[PDB]
Structure formats: structure tokens, C-alpha cells
Amino acid sequence: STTLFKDFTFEAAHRLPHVPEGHKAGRLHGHSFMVRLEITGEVDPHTGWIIDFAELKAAFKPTYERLDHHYLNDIPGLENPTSEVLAKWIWDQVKPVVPLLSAVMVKETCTAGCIYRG
Amino acid sequence: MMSTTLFKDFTFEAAHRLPHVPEGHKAGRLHGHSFMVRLEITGEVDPHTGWIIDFAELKAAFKPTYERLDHHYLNDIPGLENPTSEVLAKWIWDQVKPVVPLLSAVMVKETCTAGCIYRGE
Amino acid sequence: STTLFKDFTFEAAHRLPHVPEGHKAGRLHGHSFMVRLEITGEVDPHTGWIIDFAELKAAFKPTYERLDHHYLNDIPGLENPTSEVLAKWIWDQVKPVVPLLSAVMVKETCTAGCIYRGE
Amino acid sequence: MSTTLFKDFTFEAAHRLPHVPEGHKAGRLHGHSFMVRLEITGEVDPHTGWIIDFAELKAAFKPTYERLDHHYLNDIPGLENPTSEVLAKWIWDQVKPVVPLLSAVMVKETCTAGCIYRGE
Amino acid sequence: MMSTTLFKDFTFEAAHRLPHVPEGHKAGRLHGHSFMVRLEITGEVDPHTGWIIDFAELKAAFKPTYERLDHHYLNDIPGLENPTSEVLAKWIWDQVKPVVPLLSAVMVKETCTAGCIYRG
Amino acid sequence: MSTTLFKDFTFEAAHRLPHVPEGHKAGRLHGHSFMVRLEITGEVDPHTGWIIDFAELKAAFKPTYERLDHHYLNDIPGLENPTSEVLAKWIWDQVKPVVPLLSAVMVKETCTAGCIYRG
Numbered sequence: 001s002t003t004l005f006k007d008f009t010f011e012a013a014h015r016l017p018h019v020p021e022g023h024k025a026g027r028l029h030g031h032s033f034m035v036r037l038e039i040t041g042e043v044d045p046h047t048g049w050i051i052d053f054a055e056l057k058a059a060f061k062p063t064y065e066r067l068d069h070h071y072l073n074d075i076p077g078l079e080n081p082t083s084e085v086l087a088k089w090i091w092d093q094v095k096p097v098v099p100l101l102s103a104v105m106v107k108e109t110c111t112a113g114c115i116y117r118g
Numbered sequence: 119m120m121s122t123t124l125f126k127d128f129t130f131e132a133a134h135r136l137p138h139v140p141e142g143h144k145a146g147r148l149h150g151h152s153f154m155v156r157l158e159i160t161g162e163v164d165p166h167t168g169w170i171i172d173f174a175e176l177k178a179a180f181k182p183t184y185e186r187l188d189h190h191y192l193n194d195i196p197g198l199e200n201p202t203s204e205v206l207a208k209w210i211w212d213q214v215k216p217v218v219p220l221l222s223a224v225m226v227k228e229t230c231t232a233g234c235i236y237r238g239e
Numbered sequence: 240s241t242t243l244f245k246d247f248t249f250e251a252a253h254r255l256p257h258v259p260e261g262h263k264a265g266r267l268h269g270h271s272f273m274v275r276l277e278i279t280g281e282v283d284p285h286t287g288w289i290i291d292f293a294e295l296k297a298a299f300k301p302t303y304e305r306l307d308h309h310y311l312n313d314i315p316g317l318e319n320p321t322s323e324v325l326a327k328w329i330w331d332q333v334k335p336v337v338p339l340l341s342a343v344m345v346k347e348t349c350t351a352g353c354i355y356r357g358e
Numbered sequence: 359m360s361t362t363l364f365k366d367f368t369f370e371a372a373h374r375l376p377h378v379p380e381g382h383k384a385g386r387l388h389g390h391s392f393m394v395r396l397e398i399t400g401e402v403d404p405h406t407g408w409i410i411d412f413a414e415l416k417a418a419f420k421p422t423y424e425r426l427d428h429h430y431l432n433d434i435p436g437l438e439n440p441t442s443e444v445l446a447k448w449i450w451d452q453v454k455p456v457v458p459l460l461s462a463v464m465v466k467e468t469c470t471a472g473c474i475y476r477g478e
Numbered sequence: 479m480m481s482t483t484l485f486k487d488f489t490f491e492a493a494h495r496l497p498h499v500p501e502g503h504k505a506g507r508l509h510g511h512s513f514m515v516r517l518e519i520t521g522e523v524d525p526h527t528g529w530i531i532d533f534a535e536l537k538a539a540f541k542p543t544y545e546r547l548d549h550h551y552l553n554d555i556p557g558l559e560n561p562t563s564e565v566l567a568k569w570i571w572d573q574v575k576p577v578v579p580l581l582s583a584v585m586v587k588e589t590c591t592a593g594c595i596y597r598g
Numbered sequence: 599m600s601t602t603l604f605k606d607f608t609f610e611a612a613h614r615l616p617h618v619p620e621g622h623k624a625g626r627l628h629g630h631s632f633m634v635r636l637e638i639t640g641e642v643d644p645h646t647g648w649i650i651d652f653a654e655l656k657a658a659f660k661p662t663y664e665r666l667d668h669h670y671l672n673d674i675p676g677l678e679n680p681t682s683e684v685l686a687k688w689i690w691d692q693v694k695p696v697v698p699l700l701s702a703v704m705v706k707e708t709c710t711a712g713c714i715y716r717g
């Protein structure tokens with residue numbers, strides 16, 4: 001048994017609709033968002049891996065393309081695009097494709113983030 | 119386990135020395151580091167806010183402790199007479215857990231390549 | 240002389256209005272922008288510095304707070320908010336209050352950037 | 359309650375993956391700047407205020423580190439299929455006997471891709 | 479002088495070995511690195527596009543050379559029989575300058591802490 | 599036109615700035631993980647393919663590095679006012695005799711700021 005992870009960065013705009021009126025997050029802004037997908041499972045004795053890192057990247061690509069260079073709030077389910085909401089939303093998009101998914105981390109900035117484990 | 123965790127990272131610039139190491143050990147000399155602290159909290163996400171707590175509330179809760187550490191000599195702070203990573207991590211937990219009840223871990227990195235994670239529950 | 244620099248990070252939305260339909264930069268998006276301010280000058284013999292890093296931060300603060308947590312295209316002069324335009328714009332905003340400014344770098348992502356020198 | 363210590367090491371090596379399909383890039387001879395994080399979990403001594411000195415963990419790993427660094431991994435027995443997963447297991451198997459409090463080994467082949475192994 | 483410069487960074491994973499170091503020198507054993515290459519260009523900013531050239535255009539121009547380097551053994555590429563950072567930075571300049579006429583410098587880093595800049 | 603080599607080193611040290619005003623935070627005893635970049639410029643030898651081995655640059659700096667690392671800077675002669683600016687010049691002065699091709703010294707007290715000295 002082991003864990004594997006792969007990291008991705010996407011460039012997007014968002015705003016938080018439910019913060020108080022003068023809160024900076026309530027203004028239209030953006031971030032270089034980092035996403036880490038983590039899987040946990042058994043290592044195949046012939047391949048020597050769980051799945052190819054490239055399969056994890058390929059599995060994310062359709063979701064990446066929806067998020068990257070986009071305004072998140074216009075995506076159904078991301079009307080309140082906090083890191084927490086986004087981590088769970090990503091889990092829900094990728095879990096069908098990556099059944100070994102064990103954690104999704106979203107970082108809005110280099111110093112803050114959240115980790116969702118479904 | 120199933121969970122949702124939030125974390126926020128802070129950096130502070132401080133001097134320390136380790137008082138119990140062998141004579142001549144480099145840690146025994148007055149020196150310092152760019153310390154990194156990561157506070158992690160575990161909780162439920164409110165359906166209206168969409169968050170556990172605002173990152174800014176975490177930063178504000180930590181501020182008093184942060185200001186005691188930054189641009190200071192750690193050995194002068196009570197509880198930090200032996201200011202190892204491990205001692206500092208637990209000390210920070212003890213200071214913060216009262217104002218951040220959902221605190222689940224404290225990480226302290228003395229350098230970019232070496233550190234400690236403390237879970238106090 | 241000696242050169243000093245300091246890095247600032249701001250979180251902002253932008254959109255490039257003059258790219259072809261379909262170009263990714265033409266959609267409303269954002270980045271965590273990095274700005275490096277570089278200054279060059281004489282080190283005072285008594286202070287041991289050119290200017291305090293904090294004095295540089297304070298000088299930039301007004302301009303920083305126009306950029307951070309904002310949509311760049313709404314700022315006059317940033318209607319086409321490329322890295323190149325933004326670096327020159329920051330130079331033009333900051334040079335009056337930091338006469339020793341020698342270069343401005345803007346990075347939209349960690350792996351690329353622009354450097355402008357206005358003299 | 360628990361305390362975990364960790365230290366990161368970087369080594370410069372070549373490898374190739376022998377069991378990937380014909381034209382897979384990882385099947386060609388190449389290399390990486392590999393990063394290894396060793397994590398320890400255990401009691402912190404009330405006198406020393408640490409689990410063990412970072413320097414002692416470095417020393418414990420040094421023999422294995424020197425086998426890896428500036429080498430071709432496939433040549434090392436046990437690393438004939440030197441995936442991140444296999445390497446992390448292998449490092450654990452070398453280091454656990456010297457550092458019984460070892461609780462995880464992370465290997466990153468690149469800055470964006472990695473695996474964490476936590477024992478058998 | 480008054481000027482605008484752009485740069486973009488690319489990382490490739492490759493093996494190399496230095497053939498002219500003394501027997502025993504670590505760099506003379508087959509090994510590898512996650513190499514970083516930065517291309518710097520300088521030119522006028524077009525008043526319509528607001529840019530010198532699109533970052534994507536610089537990436538595209540470099541791709542053929544990038545593909546020769548990534549997931550390969552450098553010593554087997556003609557011109558890179560002695561694949562030092564110095565030699566590699568110049569070799570990259572020679573490959574890229576014809577397709578990126580605004581190219582002003584090439585940086586190679588073999589590790590995160592050591593590298594070389596060539597200006598032609 | 600030129601080939602430049604560089605190598606980065608990190609050392610862990612205490613310092614305080616003695617000529618800032620009372621209550622300025624840098625006036626309190628503190629420390630940093632300092633980063634130093636040494637740069638050299640010169641001809642690439644066709645036989646070795648290098649200017650000097652990165653390992654030679656590290657060895658040449660080691661004595662100076664060992665004075666700095668895990669020490670209190672203010673007690674080192676020359677570093678009574680251990681600003682980044684003063685430190686970069688001091689390192690230059692210490693290193694230039696054993697690294698004649700030295701062309702720049704950068705010092706960073708934190709990851710977001712620094713100083714470059716070029717002689």
C-alpha cells in the first residue's frame with residue numbers, strides 16, 4: 001500500500017459572494033491556484049507503480065480546462081468558490097475517473113489552503 | 119479518515135541557541151533562523167460561508183503569539199528556554215489552542231529542509 | 240553603488256482585450272502576481288543601507304493596494320494588462336516616490352516574467 | 359498526541375523504467391533531482407527537547423544517500439524497476455533497521471510528483 | 479538602459495555524465511538532474527498586443543529543442559558530449575537564437591542552487 | 599559576449615542592526631536563514647567545458663561560510679553593522695582574493711528581499 005500525489009496550478013478569477021460588504025475577498029480578483037491530487041492503493045508488482053503519474057494528469061485535464069483561465073463563479077457548483085468548496089467540487093469531478101483518490105488539496109496562495117478527504 | 123482541514127503558513131525571523139547540546143555543537147552557539155509555522159485546523163464547512171473559518175481569523179488569532187516570536191530571542195520567552203523545533207511546536211499549540219479550538223496540528227520548520235509536526239489531541 | 244530588491248505578491252483578476260477570440264488570456268481570469276522593485280544607489284556609511292526595506296514597502300503600499308484583490312482592467316492605464324504594460328505602469332507610479340528605482344519585474348506565474356527599466 | 363520530525367535530502371540520479379510501453383518517455387535513459395523526506399515519530403526527551411538530532415538522522419541516512427546520489431539507480435540491487443514507489447519502499451527497507459522510529463518515506467522525482475510510503 | 483525584457487522557465491529531466499573529470503569525481507558517474515532552462519528575450523512592446531511576443535510563442539519556438547533534451551541522455555546528442563552547464567547553455571543559445579531572434583540570454587540550472595548564464 | 603556561473607549557499611545566523619531607532623524591530627536581537635549567491639564570470643575552458651568546478655567555488659567560500667554559519671554576526675570584525683548591504687560587501691572582500699573571477703555577491707535575509715553587490 002502506498003500514496004501517490006501530483007500537483008497542478010491553474011490561473012482563475014473568483015469572488016466570494018457571502019463575505020461582509022468591505023471584505024477584500026468580495027471584490028473581483030484572482031489567484032494562481034494550486035491543486036494536489038492524492039491517491040492511495042496497492043503497487044502492481046510488474047509496473048512498480050499504482051498508476052502512472054501521467055494517468056493522474058490525464059484524468060484531471062478536463063476539470064483543469066474548466067477551471068484554468070476562467071471565472072469560477074460561472075461554473076455550476078462554484079457559485080461560492082472558497083477553497084473548501086473548490087476542494088470538494090474537484091473531488092466530485094475526479095472521483096469517477098480516479099477511484100483511488102484519497103485527498104484533494106487546494107491552495108489559493110502559496111501560504112494558505114485546505115485539504116479535503118472524502 | 120474523512121475530513122476537511124485548513125492550514126495557514128507564517129514566517130518569523132528569530133535568534134535561538136540550544137542550551138543542552140554537547141560542547142562545541144553548532145546549535146549551542148547563538149544563531150538564528152527564518153522559522154516557518156503552519157497552523158492546521160480540522161472542522162465542518164458552514165453551508166452559508168462555504169468555509170470552516172476565514173483564513174484571516176486564523177491569522178488574527180495567532181497574531182499575539184507571532185509578535186512574541188518575530189524579531190526576538192526565543193530563549194528569553196518562558197517555556198522556550200530549550201527552543202528546539204519540537205519544544206517550539208508544542209509551545210505554539212499551547213498558546214494557540216485556547217483561541218483556535220479546532221486546531222489539529224502545528225508544524226515548525228527551522229530551515230526549508232527540516233522540521234517538526236505536533237498534534238496535541 | 241549596490242542594488243537592493245524586494246518582492247511583493249498580489250492577488251488579482253485580469254483579461255487581455257487584444258488577443259484573438261479563443262485565446263485563453265482573453266477570458267476573465269486571474270493570477271497571484273509577483274512584483275519585484277529594484278533600487279540602486281549609495282549605501283550610507285552610518286545606516287549601512289541604501290534605504291530600509293520597510294521604507295520601500297511603505298512607498299509602494301498605495302500602488303499595491305490598488306492592485307491587490309482587484310480587477311486590473313478597471314484601473315486607468317491597465318486596460319490592456321499584460322506583464323509588459325503592468326511593469327511599465329508600476330514604474331511610472333512608483334518612480335516619483337522611489338527616485339532610486341532601477342527596475343520593476345512582474346511575474347504573472349512562477350515560471351515567467353517581465354523586467355522593465357525606465358532609464 | 360504525537361510529535362513527528364522530518365528532514366529533506368536531495369540527490370541527483372539517472373534511471374529508466376524497464377516495464378513501460380515501447381515509446382513511453384520514462385523508458386528512455388534520463389534522470390531527476392530526487393527529493394527524499396524521512397519522517398520519524400516518537401517521544402521527545404524532556405532533557406534534549408528532541409526526538410533525535412536532525413544531524414543524527416542525516417548521519418543514519420548517509421550510507422544509503424551516497425549509494426543513490428550521482429548514480430544510476432537501475433544498477434543498484436532492488437532498484438531494477440526504480441519507480442518512485444519502489445524507491446520509497448527500498449529507502450524504508452534500508453533505513454528502518456537503523457531508525458526504528460521511521461514512520462514515512464516520501465520520494466519526489468520532480469517538484470510536482472511524489473509518493474509517500476508508510477510501511478508494510 | 480531603458481528596456482523591456484521577458485523570460486520564461488522550462489524544466490526537463492535528463493541524464494548526463496562529464497567525460498573529462500578525473501577518475502572518481504562524482505560528476506563522472508552516469509547520473510541526472512531536473513534541469514531548468516530560462517530563456518530571456520528583449521525587444522519593443524507592440525502598442526496593440528501590449529507584449530513583446532506571447533509567452534506561448536516563446537514556448538512553441540523552444541519545443542523542438544526541449545523535446546531533444548527532456549527524458550534523454552544528453553551525452554548522446556551531438557554537441558553535448560561534454561554536457562556541462564556552460565556547454566549546455568551555449569548549445570541551447572545556438573539552437574534557439576535562429577528561431578527566437580530577440581533571444582538575449584540563456585540560463586541553465588542543474589540543481590536549484592547552481593547554474594550558468596550565457597549571453598550571446 | 600559572456601558566461602557567468604553562480605552558486606547559492608544558506609547559513610543560519612543571529613544579528614541585530616545597531617543604528618536603527620529605538621523600537622525598530624531589526625534593533626532587537628534576532629536572526630535569519632541568510633542566502634548568499636556567489637557569481638563569477640570568465641572564459642569556459644574547451645577541455646573541461648567549465649569556468650571552474652562548482653565544487654571549487656564551494657571550497658573557496660567554505661572558510662568564510664564557516665565564520666558566518668551558526669554564529670552571531672555582530673561579533674565578527676567588519677560586521678558590527680550587519681545589514682545585507684554591509685554583509686554583501688564584506689563577503690566580496692573576503693572572497694575576491696581566493697575567487698578572482700568573482701563578479702557579484704547577492705545576500706538575502708529573507709526569501710523576499712535582498713542586496714546585490716558588484717564591487
Ligand SMILES: C/C(O)=C(/O)C1=Nc2c(nc(N)[nH]c2=O)NC1
Binds near residue numbers: 174
Ligand atoms: C482573501 C481571499 O482572496 C480569499 O479568496 C479568501 N478565501 C478563503 C478564505 N478563508 C477560507 N477558509 N477559505 C477561503 O477560500 N479567506 C479569504
Ligand SMILES: C/C(O)=C(/O)C1=Nc2c(nc(N)[nH]c2=O)NC1
Binds near residue numbers: 203228363408409412
Ligand atoms: C542545527 C540547529 O541550528 C538547530 O537549531 C538544531 N535544532 C534541532 C535539531 N534537531 C532536532 N530534532 N530539533 C531541533 O530543533 N538539530 C539541530
Ligand SMILES: C/C(O)=C(/O)C1=Nc2c(nc(N)[nH]c2=O)NC1
Binds near residue numbers: 011069532534
Ligand atoms: C496566459 C495568460 O493568462 C496571460 O495573462 C498572458 N500574458 C502574457 C503573455 N505573454 C506576454 N508576453 N505577456 C503577458 O502578459 N501571454 C499570456
Ligand SMILES: C/C(O)=C(/O)C1=Nc2c(nc(N)[nH]c2=O)NC1
Binds near residue numbers: 049388440467
Ligand atoms: C516520467 C518519468 O520520468 C518517470 O520517471 C515516471 N515515473 C513514475 C511515473 N508514475 C508513477 N506512478 N511512478 C513513477 O515513478 N510516471 C513517470
Ligand SMILES: C/C(O)=C(/O)C1=Nc2c(nc(N)[nH]c2=O)NC1
Binds near residue numbers: 370564648650652
Ligand atoms: C556534480 C555534477 O553533477 C555536475 O554535473 C557538475 N557540473 C558542473 C560543475 N561545474 C561547472 N562549472 N559546471 C558544471 O556543469 N560541477 C559538477
Ligand SMILES: C/C(O)=C(/O)C1=Nc2c(nc(N)[nH]c2=O)NC1
Binds near residue numbers: 131291628680681707
Ligand atoms: C527587519 C530586519 O530583520 C532586518 O534585518 C533589516 N535589514 C535590512 C533592512 N533594510 C535594508 N536596506 N538592509 C537590511 O539589511 N531592513 C530591515
Ligand SMILES: [Zn+2]
Binds near residue numbers: 108250
Ligand atoms: Zn480569493
Ligand SMILES: [Zn+2]
Binds near residue numbers: 145151
Ligand atoms: Zn538552530
Ligand SMILES: [Zn+2]
Binds near residue numbers: 011253264268269270
Ligand atoms: Zn493572465
Ligand SMILES: [Zn+2]
Binds near residue numbers: 467
Ligand atoms: Zn523518471
Ligand SMILES: [Zn+2]
Binds near residue numbers: 370505510588
Ligand atoms: Zn551533473
Ligand SMILES: [Zn+2]
Binds near residue numbers: 131624628630
Ligand atoms: Zn534582520
